[PDB]
Copies of this chain bind each other. A is one copy, B any other.
């Protein structure tokens, strides 16, 4: 399990989403370095301009890579379910706005850790912040609180993402998360994440480039 994260792992991320009937697909490639908690990825919208802002897809697109210090390592469930992998499900509610429903399977395929994801949504207002692309291209820094679920031999987690709207207002998005092994269990803690969104100057297609630091405490 932990054995696989002693260094830099290749990453493939795939996501087909359907939001309000708008189909899109995002291929993500990059490295992951758990030892320091760094993620470095380049996402490409193979289907053209996204119907939905890149920051709304940031959480959905590998925690395994989050850096758990040795005080904590017992409690790192994500690695401990590998290489078999784990299943990750979120219900993301965008306040005064639509809902995402996601299922994703995070496992090793060959040497590369893969996140294949299905994302669905409805009841998104056109001319709202999300379909309206009224969200700033940035990402905040959130504590993500983690509890174990002895019942499904896995992890639940709750948190709210604050998106800056071009107003100066904030578009809240409540997350509800479930994970289960697909094949261990921690005591309550959280993950503090930091995230930077960026673009490639040589990229005709709609894209996002992502740098992240996640350590646990």
In the complex, per-residue mask of A101-128: 1 if CB is within 8 Å of any chain B CB, else 0: 1110000000000000011111100000
In the complex, the chain B residue whose C-beta lies closest to that of A102 is B122
Q: Are A122 and B120 in contact (CB under 8 A)?
A: yes
Number of copies: 2
Binds B, one of A16-24, A73-81, A134-142, A197-205: A16-24
Q: Are A21 and B123 in contact (CB under 8 A)?
A: no
Residues from chain B with Cβ under 8 Å of A89 in the complex: 122-123
Residue of A20, A23, A99, A120 with most chain B CB atoms under a 10 A cut-off: A120
The docked-state distance in angstroms from the alpha carbon of A21 to that of B105 is 13
Minimal beta-carbon separation of A118 from chain B (angstroms): 4
Within 8 A of B (CB), among A124-183: none
Residues from chain B with Cβ under 8 Å of A99 in the complex: 101
Additional 20 contacts, C-beta under 8 A, given A16-B21, A18-B23: A16-B18, A18-B18, A18-B118, A18-B120, A20-B103, A20-B118, A21-B118, A23-B23, A89-B122, A89-B123, A99-B101, A101-B101, A101-B122, A102-B122, A103-B122, A103-B123, A118-B122, A119-B122, A120-B120, A120-B122
Listed by A's residue number, 13 A-B pairs whose Cβ atoms lie within 8 Å are A16-B18, A16-B21, A18-B118, A18-B120, A20-B103, A20-B118, A21-B118, A89-B123, A99-B101, A101-B120, A101-B122, A118-B122, A120-B122
